[PDB]
């Protein structure tokens, strides 16, 4: 069981899988009605529920308050 973040423009799908690249294209199809990594064209160690692997940036968090710095 492996947990992905499939990202593109300003949309993001969160989903899990076991299993080939081919069949994941089908899941997307399931969600965003289109038909069939890093700068290219995914493990229990590498992609966990709390830390999905990624398949537009997010906002930049504000400055740490002074009383919370070390």
């Amino acid at each position: 069981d492996v947990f992905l973040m499939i990202r593109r423009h300003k949309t993001t799908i969160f989903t899990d899988a076991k299993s080939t690249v081919f069949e994941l294209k089908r899941i997307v199809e399931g969600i965003l009605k289109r038909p069939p990594k890093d700068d290219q064209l995914f493990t229990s160690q590498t992609a966990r529920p709390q830390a999905p692997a990624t398949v537009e940036p997010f906002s930049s968090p504000p400055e740490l308050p002074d009383v919370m710095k070390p």
């Binding site: 300003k10 993001t12 930049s60």
Partner: protein, 82 residues
């Protein structure tokens, strides 16, 4: 699946069962909007949903949270009741 929309325009698509982790969302419940919660916070919220559901029935690992997002994340959790 359901769509959760953040303050700064991002769209997150997560499995309905997982989002129900939030009392607030469970109550409101195809598409939801959060004018106050920015993407960098709402993505973490969704990960917490995955994490919560997956480990909710059995050894559990640390859920990492950078201090810089913690306050806004606490507010989100408070509003979302999760």
């Amino acid at each position: 699946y359901v769509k959760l929309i953040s303050s700064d325009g991002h769209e997150f698509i997560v499995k309905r069962e997982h989002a129900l982790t939030s009392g607030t969302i469970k109550a409101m419940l195809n598409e939801v909007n959060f004018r106050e919660i920015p993407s960098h916070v709402l993505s973490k919220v969704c990960m917490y949903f995955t994490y919560k559901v997956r480990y909710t029935n059995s050894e559990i690992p640390e859920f990492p949270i950078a201090p810089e997002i913690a306050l806004e994340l606490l507010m989100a959790a408070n509003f979302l009741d999760c």
